[PDB]
Amino acid sequence: TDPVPTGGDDPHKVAMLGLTFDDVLLLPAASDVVPATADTSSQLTKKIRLKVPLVSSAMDTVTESRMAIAMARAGGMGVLHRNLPVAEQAGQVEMVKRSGGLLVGAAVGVGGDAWVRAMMLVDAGVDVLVVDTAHAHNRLVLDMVGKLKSEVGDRVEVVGGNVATRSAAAALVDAGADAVKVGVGPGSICTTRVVAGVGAPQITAILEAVAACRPAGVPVIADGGLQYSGDIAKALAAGASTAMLGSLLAGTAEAPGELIFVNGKQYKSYRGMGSLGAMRLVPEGIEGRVPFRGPLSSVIHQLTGGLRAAMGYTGSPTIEVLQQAQFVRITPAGLKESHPHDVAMTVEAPNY
Amino acid sequence: TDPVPTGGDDPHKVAMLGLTFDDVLLLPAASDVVPATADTSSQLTKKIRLKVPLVSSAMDTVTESRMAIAMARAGGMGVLHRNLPVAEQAGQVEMVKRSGGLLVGAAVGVGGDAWVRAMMLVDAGVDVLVVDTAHAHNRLVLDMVGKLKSEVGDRVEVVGGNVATRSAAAALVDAGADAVKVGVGPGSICTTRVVAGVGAPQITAILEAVAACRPAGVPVIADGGLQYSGDIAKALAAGASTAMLGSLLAGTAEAPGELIFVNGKQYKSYRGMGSLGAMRLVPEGIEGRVPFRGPLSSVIHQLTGGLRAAMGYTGSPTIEVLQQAQFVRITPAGLKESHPHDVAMTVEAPNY
Amino acid sequence: TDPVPTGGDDPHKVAMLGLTFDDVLLLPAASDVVPATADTSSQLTKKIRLKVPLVSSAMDTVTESRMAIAMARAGGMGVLHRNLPVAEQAGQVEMVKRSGGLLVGAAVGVGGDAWVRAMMLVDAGVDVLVVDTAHAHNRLVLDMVGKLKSEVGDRVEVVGGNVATRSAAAALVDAGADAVKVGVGPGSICTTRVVAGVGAPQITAILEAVAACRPAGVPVIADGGLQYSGDIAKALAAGASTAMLGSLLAGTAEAPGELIFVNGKQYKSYRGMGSLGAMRLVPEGIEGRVPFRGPLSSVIHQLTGGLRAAMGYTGSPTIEVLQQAQFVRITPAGLKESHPHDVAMTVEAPNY
Amino acid sequence: TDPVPTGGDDPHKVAMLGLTFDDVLLLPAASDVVPATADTSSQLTKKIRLKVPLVSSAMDTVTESRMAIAMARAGGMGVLHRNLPVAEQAGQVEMVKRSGGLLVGAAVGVGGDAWVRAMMLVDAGVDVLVVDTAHAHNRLVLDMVGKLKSEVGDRVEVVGGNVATRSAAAALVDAGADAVKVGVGPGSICTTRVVAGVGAPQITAILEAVAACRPAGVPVIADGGLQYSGDIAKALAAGASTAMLGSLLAGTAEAPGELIFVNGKQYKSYRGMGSLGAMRLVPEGIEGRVPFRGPLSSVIHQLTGGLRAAMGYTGSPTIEVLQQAQFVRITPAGLKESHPHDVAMTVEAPNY
Ligand SMILES: COc1cc([C@H](C)NC(=O)Nc2ccccc2)ccc1-c1cnco1
Ligand SMILES: COc1cc([C@H](C)NC(=O)Nc2ccccc2)ccc1-c1cnco1
Ligand SMILES: COc1cc([C@H](C)NC(=O)Nc2ccccc2)ccc1-c1cnco1
Ligand SMILES: COc1cc([C@H](C)NC(=O)Nc2ccccc2)ccc1-c1cnco1
Ligand SMILES: O=c1[nH]cnc2c1ncn2[C@@H]1O[C@H](COP(=O)(O)O)[C@@H](O)[C@H]1O
Ligand SMILES: O=c1[nH]cnc2c1ncn2[C@@H]1O[C@H](COP(=O)(O)O)[C@@H](O)[C@H]1O
Ligand SMILES: O=c1[nH]cnc2c1ncn2[C@@H]1O[C@H](COP(=O)(O)O)[C@@H](O)[C@H]1O
Ligand SMILES: O=c1[nH]cnc2c1ncn2[C@@H]1O[C@H](COP(=O)(O)O)[C@@H](O)[C@H]1O
Questions:
Q1: Is CATH 3.40.50.880 what the domain over A1-352 is classified as, yes or no?
Q2: What's the gap between Cα D216 and its chain centre?
């Protein structure tokens, strides 16, 4: 009998061909939708629907109270990071709540200390707890999700992540998650794929997680690796209901951390929460910087405008229809035709 | 049952593998054709045949009256852009017509204002109306094409675009289009693929559109992404009847806009019509520059010479036979062998 | 009958599709393992188990006595290079042995002189002889392995390499090898693939060699091409039992050769043993430099920490379970998402 | 019925997947061959066997009399270029012949003038006429080959080229060619692939041509695109009997043209014969420069040493056995592992 053409005799050793955002384009389809008439609302969780299907990452260079307020006012939501004392994270929940009953989420880990944190976040009025771990396919993480759902699930929605497989998503669904957050390896500041050799290209990860979550009515949050507004449309078309953004929002005025003026231009610090600086285990993230991008409201407007254009091209009046769109797979040469090419760009563009 | 190897359980979610120009080469075949004896004529529309199968883009940095005159004199045609008052666009049609009864086209949009524009262009003597939209697979665009064909179709040919699928091309055929223009995403200055995440690699887009248009006897115009004279031959071999060029013609003396002398070299402005500067929706194009390339006549001579060489290699005495040629698909390493490699180029080449 | 789509009529002419480390990621799986509880021990040979599944290359810029001592103290092993007099190589074996009964290996070639070298290494107390050749699939190399096993195999373990195919691995198993070392072409300083045109991508090479060695109970050493700690996890998941490292260890304080201070930074010499400088046949290696990386102990800690993270993600409590993990194959775009992207890295990372 | 996944309904429109040298590696196999004992002799034509399976390109920056003499003395052969008067090309044939009865070839075109040239080359003592054209799959080229074979074929061997398909190779075999030269598009200075859009990746081109020529006993010359000594082994393994080199030999002392000292280093002019400068049709080649590489004899020694290493790895005692070797196909990531990587090269290598 002939070997598997990539080696050995086990056809399941190399189990899948993983596609990322740059591997696919959305195909145009028959459409009565124009960007103005598209409806961008979508479920964050079973019970919570957002006007704009975007949430900010639970990172100490992305989301504290000002980002959470701005995201909610723009129609999305912030997830407050957990790299700070319990009392301060709960205080920031209260700061968001005092700004008009805006929606807010907050991350917690797993274990006794994370439980105390979760309880004080609930008492502070948080709408969404995000059980936020590097590898959610673990009974301790599943136990955390289910125990939160058991004890405070009437009052608060409970998200679990992160996963990158159908079986891991199914495990979180069975534990009672109100949403499943997908992404192991794809983040712009993540080094898991080189440090551990572990990951899953995000379009395939979403397609697999959605195969478990969609039939259970559980929304999927696509988390990490989105670098363009078009990636939002691709993630939702692969079946996610919202996207979580770190890099694309770290450059905004509302993101915490230093505004850096270096060699005539403007940047802001952006670092993985598994980086050496954030943990102060070998690090699984880097510390870096992103270009300054101005007010959050303006960035969100550009991102949602790109999503609306995709809905016009695909004939999607709603995100639920966009989730039914088809991809074409592209080659490395198609990636060059898919970006502007063979021209020296001379003027600034707001979305490129 | 086993999942689709790229994810999920739907084998049609990723519907196609899209090839662009750089993914294929034309195979040599038995030939009695030399470049001198090839016949490059081809249908622009059902009724209009061009000596040279090339048209200039309807862009305000590519085609006003001087480009339209020069293109017609070279055996092709210009499509006058519509980013100017109706009276001025109609005036430029008259300027071309007063230069010897040369062929000319002009772009219009969709709606009442575009209708008034179309009527004055017809009164000015235009030969071809191009209903020119980002996404033609829309009943309003189809209605525009059919109503123009109904009211003025005896006097003028009516082109509709742009499309990137078989179903969208078929819809324009059924609406009565005299030609179908193909290209969503491929243009050198286009950012639709990153802003919206939408597009289709152009060789596959042409092959699919031709599968609908060729059996209906409707010519296909391949529009966008052509960067070399060899790309003209590839587009026609995939079944298109003409190619529309923006970047390759924007650098010519006849293209409107500024001749820029920067750091000792010469450039000209070239910008998407969906760029911020041209619209003055989030932009779907960039503003940039291309190297100055001299007189249009000389550029067209180089492009048609490359097409003639392809016809010699493929044994194609006519464009209709070139449309029957075969491709070989290449890998990323083949792309390096397909360009000149491992040599420092020391002398200027007119076509490279 | 139709040709093979890549050419000719022989479907076995292009026999395999070879994957390297960058072509695959490890998939997360259900896990009760955290990095702290993983057990990284693994068989170097049939009889020798290491606490850390790492050995240093038998190269004159990687392993002399200080590297061998440090590797053994860290839980792995050094293989002393053979580009020096027999008496000196045997002396370095004694130096390692006098430092606490640490494990040590030493390379030998093939023939009468290599036999004398092997005998004096055994008399000096060496634990592992490595019959170390460019192409082990040769009866002279197989004879060397079997004769060593026959004469001194009670006292010392005998490794043979290098191979890159199932049939070559099977030949070494039949000759009596206590381990099989895999890698033809992949080394960072190797030029065999361009000089001879010969090689095999290392993930496929390991999968094929393991298909012969694993059913015979013979451990596989993955040798060459590992550039990140995640590559260690990938090699072991493909079925190898240990990894051999040149580049990743050449930058350490214990590696022999010059510490180079050039343009404000620190490097160390690193050269192929088939390079012109090491042989003083056309060369099959280059002479170069790698960044200085500090003490070996610290490098090994970072590499094993990355391996432990992979074991946590894959649910592997032991290396034997990690050998059962699954890959996802990635595209060239996935390689960019798999490295940190779209951020200017501003702070040093210990493992990236 | 479902479309072809790359577009349209014709499964033969994209007829093949073309591999180039960088797409494949030779697999190691069981071997009693070492580089010293390999036999590199091979048929140039039906009647002519060379000690070294290498010929120099018929280019005015590669082969005049000094290169032809040096190539013959090294065991290969030169093909004198035809971009000079008939009397001078015939004179250079005589110059080679007066240097010890060395073998020599000379290029001719097609038509009456090429016939006069061929007759005077035969009278001057040439051993091989090379009917040398951009596209040999043409009855005029086939007629030239057959008429030369009819009139002078007792005295001289007749080669025809260039082709890139099985059908074109078969046509030259039927015309009576004593060898078939393969390569449309691959040359380092060639721009046919971008100017005309025409070509065929060279490994697939050789495999297809060999499928026609080998069963007829007609040797195949692999011409163009070879950039490393390992590419020689790959071309012969794909079934070619000799390789023709332009770039790799243009940098030698014996190549005609200027030795250029620019910014402290040494180069020599190298230009396509379809470049503007050589023709003084749109050009299908560029004018450039290559690094100076010293005496031809030394370059040939390095190239043949790499070929001998490949024969050792593949177990090929003769070129006829090397023609039976197998490839592994590699990915873009394998191309990086196949070159030296992640090391700053600090010392010159003679073959890299
Ligand atoms: C604090 O944040 C993170 C810390 C890490 C640490 C560095 N690694 C780690 O926990 N590895 C691990 C543990 C158990 C099982 C398998 C591996 C890694 C990732 C993140 C992070 C943050 N958003 C996504 O991931
Ligand atoms: C003015 O020209 C263009 C404006 C645009 C604008 C920016 N986008 C847009 O209209 N989006 C859209 C609308 C409806 C449905 C789906 C999406 C985009 C492309 C072009 C253009 C010009 N040649 C080709 O495309
Ligand atoms: C001294 O070390 C090496 C010398 C060489 C020499 C340069 N090549 C060579 O022996 N070729 C060969 C011989 C027989 C059959 C086939 C080809 C090549 C590789 C290495 C080396 C060191 N770790 C791995 O490879
Ligand atoms: C003088 O040398 C060459 C001139 C050319 C010219 C520029 N092109 C040309 O002849 N095209 C052609 C003619 C007939 C049918 C199809 C196309 C192209 C290639 C070469 C050349 C030299 N070694 C290989 O190719
Ligand atoms: O250090 C880390 N290692 C791995 N992933 C991280 C780390 N820090 C944050 N993340 C993830 O990366 C996401 C942001 O990715 P980005 O939008 O591509 O920048 C976050 O929402 C987290 O899921
Ligand atoms: O801003 C824009 N966004 C997208 N496509 C554009 C825009 N402006 C012009 N185009 C298209 O791009 C084509 C030119 O592409 P090029 O020849 O590759 O430069 C035009 O003929 C239009 O179809
Ligand atoms: O000159 C050489 N040519 C080919 N391989 C070599 C040479 N020198 C050392 N090696 C191999 O390369 C390995 C190290 O590869 P690295 O870890 O990728 O730097 C060694 O363990 C040997 O197997
Ligand atoms: O201008 C040209 N256009 C296309 N091919 C050329 C031209 N000049 C020489 N060649 C081919 O290129 C080969 C050399 O390729 P190289 O070894 O890759 O530099 C020659 O032997 C010819 O077959």
A1: no
A2: 20
